[PDB]
Write a protein that binds this ligand. Structure first.
Ligand SMILES: [Zn+2]
Ligand SMILES: [Zn+2]
Ligand SMILES: [Zn+2]
Lengths: 271, 165, 65, 98, 85, 196, 114, 136, 783, 43
């Protein structure tokens, strides 16, 4: 119900978004997934301070391990980038500090899940920094395992970040992408041995289009329209937002030019 | 064997011919035989060719032989190279091997001949012969850290005055 | 070592799925194949993160001090 | 047909580093010799007690993985429990020129 | 003692790659040490890139002394020599 | 290197964004050039790859065992029943552009080793420093920060170029040069250098 | 050991303007701009939404060397039309699509069950 | 600095797909002009040429050597063509074995053309500018 | 031999190497780290102070930096420490030891250094990461690859040296190898496999991509090429745009096989001016071949142009390729079910043809070939029966391959692999071998304990029936094992000879340098040659052009060179000259035209006396095929308007040309004799190609266009003289030692008539140089 | 560690080639590259 791009969702859940992105230039649809993949910001541990670690894993091994852990990233858009916040080092308006305390309680194996993470700085009341669980059993990922008098004491300073800087800041997972099932654009030349038709399978996406008809001659003037995407969220940002924030961030850095361009005109000609 | 031959009409018609191939060499007394061509009979023993047909025929077999080695493997080296080689093994009277028996040990340049093989023994007799060393060769000028008469150093450089202009 | 979080390739969080995996075999009497499909691991980029995993951690802890 | 013995299983003509090779009987021979030399320079778990010994220099793999394709002989060599590499997703394409 | 008279053209009038290179080098070693340049710099400042312009204008005050095996030798100034290659 | 003498270094790294990608959304962890295939001749590497897919997929284990009734036909009768191109090919899309790659690409799971030898442990440079005792030449090794060897074989290549002043340098300026006093008659180094 | 810090794929050092715009010496009415700390997400998009304008003669980008973030766009247009404007007008069109994409997407999302 | 260079009506006699899909070698002859044959390469993916056809073939060269081909926009600018099929080319030689006749050699950036007749002694030049138009 | 002839040196580096598709040919990726450590002594001149004082202050840690500063009194100010490190007033005469920056002289070798081309100058481009990076096409002269090869680098300390690096050692200068007259760098792997793809007829690019590419080429004239196809849809050919990398005035002619200036399947390669006309570009062209585009572009335009060409080609190919895709799957080693069957049946009648030759020999009917054993003529027999069995089956698989077959497409490009490799992989792997002999009896009268005794069947003695695809069997495996092992064995212990030879050759020739008298002599003044390589010519500036004076009809030769003014039937048509008629008759000119033809026929018999072969194509200076094309494309001559020459102009002109192709400048009897003789050969090409009946018919030259061709050949020639200084000693040894280094394994089967039976390969070469008295295979050959 | 503990040395006809009798005792493929190639064996 607009005048441009025409999305239509077919199936979509807590973690999946199956839609046809009608009526767009290719160069767009692509730049959309890339910016998606790794240009939206998120929160994830980016500094670990180690008090004691007598586990079987080594310090930086867990340190790395923690980064990857999906931290909630909703109201993340109102947390200053740590590299801007005038505060020396880290602070509460540019970081959610977390703490980890786990000891080998019993003689049986002591699992250290992420549920065991403790927010310690003021959230100034915003949705952000709650480590994320999807585990039925209610346990968020798995950090380390313990046995007896094995202590582990940690302090995590999570920060704002872009995947482009490190994949631990990726809210993307895998992004499905396909245009033109029945290859009517002849964008690909099929490698074969006999009936190229029986040699490749047809993707579910073929039921949404028509057979090429061999009796018809190749269509030359034809550009790529209609893409069959499917975005999956890691979970720190709901599915919908990833795509939405994607569109935004694109639009954003697109304008940061359109502006910066204008900020060079009234620069030389003016004074 | 095949062969290319001038045809009375003009073309280089292919003429097929019978040829004899043999194990072992006595060129001395094979070419004297009636029935054969004693201007084409060829023996890969270039060393024998050297005693029967003189030194300059030698130069030609040694080359052909160095050549047939390179070309036998699909390779190609420009004549002017192997040639130069083949020649060095020739100007010294007769066939002169590529070992401390062939080249060097030929009143060349003690320091030089020394830097190949047989290092002490060379210097020893070099000290008993009272050898004066030319100091023109490459190696002699490396063993002294001087610029050697080579390409860049083949010549001198001087100031011509008059310019002053 | 220990199950990694997120499959190198894609990125889908796998770290939390280790237990569920084992539990689906020994307790539910299934094969590694259909166990991976109960876990939401459709893409094979991730399938090999779990399937080819080796939990050295168990034998690591076995040591005392 | 006047046999006397019978071989155990022919894969048994191979060595400890060699039996690591999947389908060595589809490779040009010198190749299998190369892999034999490198298998000894791959990287992973060299002993489960590596955190306790004090040897000059030793390398351990963050996340070792039992190969998706194996030898029946890997079984006795305990390669699946002490792997030395990772099942990476690999692409055979031109893609740029790097 | 014994030097081949101005004439008698026994050698090349052209400049060998090893002469040219060696000359360019020698001026480059003077240009580097605040020595006068005999060309107007078109706005370049590299002793090797300069000497090249000194070569085009043919204003390098150097004489190649070429040696013949027997001991005798020839003198060619960088005026006389042709720079072809 | 894989498992079939297929050694190689990492030339570059690309982020999941600039990388080719299958319509499934999968990105390859590493890309090898099809050129190092027919010339050396390693078919197994190619099989292992086509088996290990079907293994990941059906969630089973791979039977690479040497002499067996295992066929690359009977493999691909399986990958086919698994919604795939029976020889390992997968339609991909460029990264920078997302334009469907004209030629399909063989791409799959393949065990890769990580051999020692890492640039930062080979890397070495020196501009002067540690000399030897006797020679007064540069000391050997990189773990003493020493200079590299300019072996006669390298002296040759140089003379060939006729670069002479350069090779006087590689034997005076750098390395060795030393000053002595000589005699007008005998020509030894007996001269008592009572300088100053 | 020599690896250059990751934040160098988006941030800008000292005296590193985000756009340098230069006159193409080769062909008249042509320009070659140098986007700093950008890539195929930006370059590719600008180019295609730039070839829709029937008033443009030439347009294409290049990424010099994949070590460094930076592409170059070269644009030549009909005489009597500054390319900066052709850029200007193209950026907007994109935004206009995205702004409208965004809205269209919401309109759908809100609808779906799950 | 314009105008046609040659014109005729030809008869398709052999459409040869020599291990290609996006190209053909066409063997076509002349009508009423007897001794005149033409060997051309035709991208059949765009303009399909079945055998036993007829094509109006025109050379001409109409509408700083190359002035950077500007985009079509032929809606406002008057074109040079009412033909289904155009190609730009170059002539690389003119064959004169005996004859009585004459043959032309043309390369449309890769697609080749050999034509055969005689009444073109002042029609075709040893020149770059050469087009080719096809209809019906 | 370790402390004087080869020292350890400072100002040197080393690291793993890797390829860069976007690097320049003469360049070299040098990691900041190293560029931070290697220093170059630079004197303070009012030219550099501004940049220097900044470097000094910039500090030893920010790349454009510098440690140490040398003062007048000879002090050494260490800028890591030193209180006045941020202070300091650089005046003139002081030196700053700056870091290595972009575009600098660095000598960049790789062992084993057995070439001049193993040691080349590159240009620095300081880079991130920690590898030396270099252009893929500087691969071949080093023999490098990127599977963990390291390389070296040396930084000059003096200007003299700096120059001496980038004036002789510079990479673009080395493009044409003085070893074999031919370019030693070319288009390799990816770029090659795709600059075929791009050039197919099917391959059509369109606007979106087309424009990018144009932009991709640097110094691209900024002019869209008019689309080949401008029909319904503006598309360009592949070749269309690649032609944009190729410079102007560059001409190329091939004719492969079925090449009728139409080429059924794009055979041959015609390149006109700056564009290409027909053909498919690949190995023979873009490769480092003798007549390849590189040899042409180099002698024609220069190095610096050719060196920039390398860049362009790749930059484009790469891009197109990058966005088109190329792969290799196992379906690229399958063959049709009908074919797979036919192969097993083409091995079955050739494993049976061997049962009969055994069945025969065993009933003592097999007659022995004169001079060999009965067992010898059985062995030789069977071996051949099995080889011919494989290549029959092999080239049964190469016919069954589709054009869309990636493996095939790499051979068709010549990027990697050949025929044998197809056959191995898909049809059959073939017989094994050791010592030359087929699989031995290590166990008594059998091969393996899995066999009976006295079994000389294929399978028993090491014929692997099965292919690398179908998989070997247990025994087969083991045999192939014994075989391949021999490879590693040789390369392990044979090299130490191939490398000792090199050292001897080098050490025996070494100081043989061409002097300022043009004679080839050593340290004693002893002459070796009286003119280098018999004519004083630098191997580099040379190429093989046929002397169309030899092969030809006793009559067809008349047809070509004979002008009979005073004969109405063998004069030259008035339409070939401004004179034309009013020249018919005339007994004074028919003296010179006789004089020409008398000398030409006198040549024909003289060449037929040197080159008894009947072989025309011989390596000679100055390419004349190209100087002509460079005329009739420079002056734009029409083959219709009559010439404007005198019979004197041409005939007496060429005579006057030969007077100044000096090689020996001396002014006495013998000198001018050798000088005349050392030119002999060249002239018989000259006289043959500048023959009056030719420079007025085949290629109608004008007056002005001729004086050009002439004046042009003179200078071209003088360029091709050898330079006094050149040390041909080393050069020759190397040029022989390298290809020697290429002899290993087989040596000497070797895919042909089988056996030899004479000693070849290194073994032979070892005798040839030892002047060996006891040679394994002496041979008489009588006609 | 496994492959070192099963290593066969040899001091100094043609004792590098893989000899029939090696079948099932020494491994065909396992051997060091260059230097001392084939004088060293793995069981
Ligand atoms: Zn803060
Ligand atoms: Zn995954
Ligand atoms: Zn004294």
């Amino acid at each position: 119900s607009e005048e441009g791009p025409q999305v239509k969702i077919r199936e979509a859940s807590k973690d999946n978004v199956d839609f046809i992105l009608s009526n767009v230039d290719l160069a767009m649809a692509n730049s959309l997934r890339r910016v998606m993949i790794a240009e939206i910001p998120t929160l994830a541990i980016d500094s670990v301070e180690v008090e004691t670690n007598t586990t079987v894993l080594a310090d930086e091994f867990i340190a790395h391990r923690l980064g990857l852990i999906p931290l909630q990233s909703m109201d993340i858009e109102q947390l200053e980038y740590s590299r801007d916040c005038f505060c020396e080092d880290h602070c509460d308006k540019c970081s959610v500090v977390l703490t980890l305390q786990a000891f080998g309680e019993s003689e049986s194996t002591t699992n250290v899940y992420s549920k065991d993470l403790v927010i310690v700085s003021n959230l100034m009341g915003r949705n952000i920094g709650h480590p994320i669980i999807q585990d039925k059993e209610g346990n968020g990922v798995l950090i380390c395992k313990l046995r007896k008098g094995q202590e582990l004491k940690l302090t995590c300073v999570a920060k704002k970040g872009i995947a482009k800087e490190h994949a631990k800041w990726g809210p993307a997972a895998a992004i499905e992408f396909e245009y033109d099932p029945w290859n009517k654009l002849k964008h690909t030349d099929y490698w074969y041995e006999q009936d190229s038709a029986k040699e490749w399978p047809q993707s579910k996406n073929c039921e949404y289009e028509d057979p090429p008809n061999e009796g018809d001659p190749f269509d030359y003037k034809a550009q790529a329209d209609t893409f069959y995407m499917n975005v999956e969220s890691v979970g720190s940002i709901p599915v919908d937002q990833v795509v939405v924030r994607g569109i935004d961030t694109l639009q954003k850095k697109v304008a940061s030019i359109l502006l910066a361009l204008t900020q060079m005109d009234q620069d030389k000609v003016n004074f | 064997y095949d062969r290319k031959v001038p045809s009375p009409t003009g073309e280089y018609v292919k003429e097929p011919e019978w040829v004899l191939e043999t194990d072992g060499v006595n060129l001395s007394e094979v070419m004297t035989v009636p029935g054969i061509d004693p201007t084409r009979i060829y023996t890969n023993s270039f060393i024998d060719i050297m005693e029967v047909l003189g030194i300059e025929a030698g130069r030609a077999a040694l080359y052909k032989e160095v050549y047939n080695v390179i070309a036998s493997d699909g390779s190609y080296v420009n004549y002017r190279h192997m040639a130069l080689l083949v020649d060095v093994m020739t100007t010294q009277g007769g066939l002169t091997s590529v070992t401390r028996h062939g080249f060097n040990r030929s009143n060349t340049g003690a320091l030089m001949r020394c830097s190949f093989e047989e290092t002490v023994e060379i210097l020893f007799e070099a000290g008993a012969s009272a050898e004066l060393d030319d100091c023109r060769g490459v190696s002699e000028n490396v063993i002294l850290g001087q610029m050697a008469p080579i390409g860049t150093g083949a010549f001198d450089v001087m100031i011509d005055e008059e310019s002053l202009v | 070592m220990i199950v990694p979080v997120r499959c190198f390739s894609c990125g889908k969080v796998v770290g939390d799925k280790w237990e569920s995996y084992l539990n689906l075999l020994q307790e539910d009497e299934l094969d590694e194949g259909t166990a991976l499909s109960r876990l939401g691991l459709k893409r094979y980029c991730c399938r090999r993160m779990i399937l080819t995993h080796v939990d050295l951690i168990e034998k690591f802890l076995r040591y005392n001090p | 047909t006047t046999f006397t013995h019978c071989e155990i299983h022919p894969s048994m003509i191979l060595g400890v580093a060699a039996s690591i090779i999947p389908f060595p009987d589809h490779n040009q021979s010198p190749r299998n010799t190369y892999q034999s030399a490198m298998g000894k320079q791959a990287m992973g778990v060299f002993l489960t007690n590596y955190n306790v010994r004090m040897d000059t220099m030793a390398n351990i793999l963050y996340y070792p993985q039992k190969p998706l394709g194996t030898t029946r002989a890997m079984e006795y060599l305990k390669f699946r429990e002490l792997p030395a590499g990772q099942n990476a997703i690999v692409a055979i394409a031109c893609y740029s020129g790097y | 003692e014994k030097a081949i008279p101005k004439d008698q053209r026994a050698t090349t009038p052209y400049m060998t790659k090893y002469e040219r290179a060696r000359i360019l080098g020698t001026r480059a070693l003077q240009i580097s040490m605040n020595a006068p340049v005999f060309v107007d710099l078109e706005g370049e400042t590299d002793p090797l890139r300069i000497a090249m312009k000194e070569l085009a204008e043919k204003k390098i005050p150097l004489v190649i002394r070429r040696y013949l095996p027997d001991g005798s030798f020839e003198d060619w100034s960088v005026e006389e020599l042709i720079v072809d290659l | 290197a894989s498992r079939h003498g297929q050694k190689g270094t990492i030339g570059i790294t690309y982020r999941r964004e600039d990388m080719p990608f299958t319509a499934e959304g999968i990105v390859p962890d590493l890309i090898i050039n099809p050129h190092a295939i027919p010339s050396r001749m390693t078919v197994a590497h190619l099989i292992e790859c086509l088996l290990s897919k079907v293994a990941a997929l059906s969630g089973n284990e791979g039977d690479a065992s040497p002499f067996t009734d295992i066929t690359v036909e009977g493999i691909s009768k399986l990958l086919r029943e698994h919604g795939y191109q029976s020889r390992g090919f997968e339609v991909m899309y460029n990264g920078h552009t997302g334009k469907k790659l004209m030629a399909q690409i063989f791409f799959g799971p393949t065990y890769y080793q990580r051999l020692r030898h890492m640039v930062d442990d080979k890397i070495h440079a020196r501009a002067r420093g540690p000399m030897q005792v006797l020679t007064r030449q540069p000391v050997e090794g990189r773990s003493r920060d020493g200079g590299l060897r300019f072996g006669e074989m390298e002296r040759d290549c140089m003379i060939a170029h006729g670069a002479a002043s350069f090779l006087k340098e590689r034997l005076m300026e750098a390395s060795d040069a030393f000053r002595v006093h000589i005699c007008g008659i005998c020509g030894l180094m007996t001269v008592i250098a009572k300088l100053n | 050991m020599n690896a250059p810090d990751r934040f160098e794929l988006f941030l800008l050092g000292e005296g590193e303007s985000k756009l340098k715009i230069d006159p193409d010496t080769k062909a008249p009415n042509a320009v070659v701009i140098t986007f700093e700390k950008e890539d195929h997400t930006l370059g590719n998009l600008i180019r295609a939404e730039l070839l829709n304008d029937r008033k443009v003669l030439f347009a294409a980008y290049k990424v010099e060397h994949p070590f460094f973030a930076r592409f170059k766009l070269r644009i030549q247009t009909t005489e009597g039309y500054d390319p900066k404007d052709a850029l200007k007008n193209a950026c907007n069109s994109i935004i206009n699509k995205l702004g409208a994409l965004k809205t269209n997407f919401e309109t759908e999302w809100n609808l779906q069950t799950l | 600095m314009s105008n046609t260079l040659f014109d005729d009506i030809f008869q398709v006699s052999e459409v040869d797909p020599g291990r290609y899909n996006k190209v053909c070698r066409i063997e076509a002859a002349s009508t009423t002009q007897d001794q005149c044959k033409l060997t051309l390469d035709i991208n059949v993916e765009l303009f399909p040429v079945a055998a036993q056809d007829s094509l109006t073939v025109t050379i001409a060269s109409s509408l700083s050597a190359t002035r950077s081909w500007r985009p079509p926009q032929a809606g406002d600018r008057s074109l040079a063509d009412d033909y289904d099929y155009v190609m730009y080319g170059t002539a690389y030689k003119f064959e004169e074995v005996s004859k009585d006749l004459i043959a032309v050699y043309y390369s449309f950036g890769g697609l080749l053309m050999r034509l055969e007749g005689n009444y073109r002694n002042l029609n075709n030049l040893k020149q770059e500018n050469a087009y080719l138009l096809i209809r019906r | 031999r370790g402390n004087l002839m080869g020292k350890r040196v400072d100002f040197s580096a080393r690291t793993v190497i890797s390829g860069d598709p976007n690097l320049e040919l003469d360049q070299v990726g040098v990691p900041k780290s190293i560029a931070k450590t290697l220093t170059y002594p630079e004197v303070v001149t009012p030219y550099n102070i501004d940049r220097l004082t900044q470097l000094v202050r910039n500090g030893p840690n920010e790349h454009p930096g510098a440690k140490y500063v040398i003062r007048d009194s000879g002090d050494r100010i260490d800028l890591r420490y030193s209180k006045r490190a941020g202070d300091i007033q650089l005046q003139y005469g002081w030196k700053v030891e700056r870091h290595i920056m972009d575009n600098d002289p660095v000598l960049f070798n790789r062992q084993p250094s057995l070439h001049k081309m193993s040691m080349m100058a590159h240009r620095v481009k300081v880079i991130p990461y920690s590898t030396f990076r270099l252009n893929l096409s500087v691969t071949s002269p080093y023999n490098a690859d990127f599977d963990g090869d390291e390389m070296n680098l040396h930084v000059p300390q003096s200007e003299e040296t700096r120059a001496e690096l980038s004036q002789l050692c510079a990479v673009p200068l080395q493009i044409v190898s003085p070893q074999s007259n031919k370019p030693c760098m070319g288009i390799v792997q990816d770029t090659l496999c795709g600059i075929r793809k791009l050039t197919l007829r099917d391959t059509f690019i369109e606007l979106d991509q087309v424009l990018n590419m144009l932009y991709w080429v640097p110094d691209w004239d900024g002019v869209i090429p008019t689309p080949a196809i401008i029909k319904p849809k503006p598309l360009w050919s592949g070749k269309q745009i690649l032609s944009v990398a190729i410079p102007n005035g560059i001409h190329l002619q091939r004719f492969d096989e079925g090449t009728t200036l139409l080429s059924p399947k794009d055979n041959g390669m015609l390149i006109i001016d700056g564009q290409i006309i027909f053909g498919v570009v690949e190995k023979k062209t873009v490769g480092s071949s003798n007549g390849g585009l590189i040899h042409v572009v180099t002698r024609e335009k220069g190095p610096q142009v050719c060196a920039k060409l390398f860049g362009n080609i790749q930059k484009v190919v790469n891009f197109w390729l990058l966005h088109n895709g190329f792969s290799t799957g196992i379906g690229d080693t399958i063959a049709d079910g009908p074919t797979m069957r036919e192969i097993t049946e083409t091995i079955a009648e050739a494993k049976k043809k061997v049962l009969d030759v055994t069945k025969e020999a065993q009933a003592n009917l097999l007659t022995a070939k004169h001079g060999m054993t009965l067992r010898e003529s059985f062995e030789d027999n069977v071996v051949r029966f099995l080889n011919e069995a494989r290549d029959k089956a092999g080239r049964l698989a190469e016919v069954n391959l589709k054009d869309l077959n990636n493996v095939k497409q790499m051979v068709m490009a010549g990027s990697k692999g050949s025929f044998i490799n197809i056959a191995q992989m898909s049809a059959c792997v073939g017989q094994q071998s050791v010592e030359g002999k087929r699989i031995a009896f290590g166990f008594v009268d059998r091969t393996l304990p899995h066999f009976s005794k006295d079994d000389y069947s294929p399978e028993s003695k090491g014929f692997v029936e099965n292919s690398y695809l179908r998989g070997l069997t247990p025994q087969e495996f083991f045999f192939h094992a014994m075989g391949g092992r021999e490879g590693l064995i040789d390369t392990a212990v044979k090299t130490a000879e191939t490398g000792y030879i090199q050292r001897r050759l080098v050490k025996a020739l070494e100081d043989i340098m061409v002097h300022y008298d043009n004679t080839t002599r050593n340290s004693l003044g002893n002459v070796i040659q009286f003119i280098y390589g018999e004519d004083g010519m630098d191997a580099a500036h040379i190429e093989k052009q046929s002397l169309d004076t030899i092969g030809g009809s006793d009559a067809a030769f008349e047809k070509r060179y004979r002008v009979d003014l005073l004969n109405t039937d063998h004069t030259l048509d008035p339409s070939l000259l401004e004179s034309g008629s009013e020249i018919l008759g005339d007994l004074k000119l028919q003296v010179l035209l006789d004089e020409e033809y008398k000398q030409l026929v006198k040549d024909r018999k003289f060449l037929r006396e040197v080159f008894v072969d009947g072989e025309a194509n011989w390596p000679l200076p100055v390419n004349i095929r190209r100087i002509i094309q460079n005329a009739q494309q420079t002056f734009h001559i029409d083959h219709t308007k009559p010439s404007d020459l005198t019979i004197k102009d041409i005939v007496l002109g060429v005579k006057d040309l030969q007077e100044n192709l000096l090689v020996l400048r001396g002014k006495n009897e013998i000198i001018q004799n050798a000088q005349r003789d050392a030119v002999t050969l060249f002239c018989c090409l000259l006289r043959s190609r500048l023959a009056t009946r030719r420079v007025l018919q085949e290629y109608r030259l004008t007056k002005q266009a001729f004086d050009w061709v002439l004046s042009n050949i003179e200078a071209q020639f003088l360029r091709s003289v050898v330079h006094p200084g050149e040390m041909v000693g080393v050069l020759a040894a190397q040029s022989i030692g390298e290809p020697a280094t290429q002899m290993t394994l087989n040596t000497f089967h070797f895919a042909g008539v089988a056996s030899k039976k004479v000693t070849s390969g290194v073994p032979r070469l070892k005798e040839i140089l030892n002047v060996a008295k006891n040679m394994k295979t002496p041979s008489l050959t009588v006609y | 560690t496994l492959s070192h503990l099963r290593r066969t040395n040899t001091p100094i006809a043609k004792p590098r080639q893989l000899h029939n009798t090696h079948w099932g005792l020494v491994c065909p493929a396992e051997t060091p590259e260059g230097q001392a190639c084939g004088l060293v064996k793995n069981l």
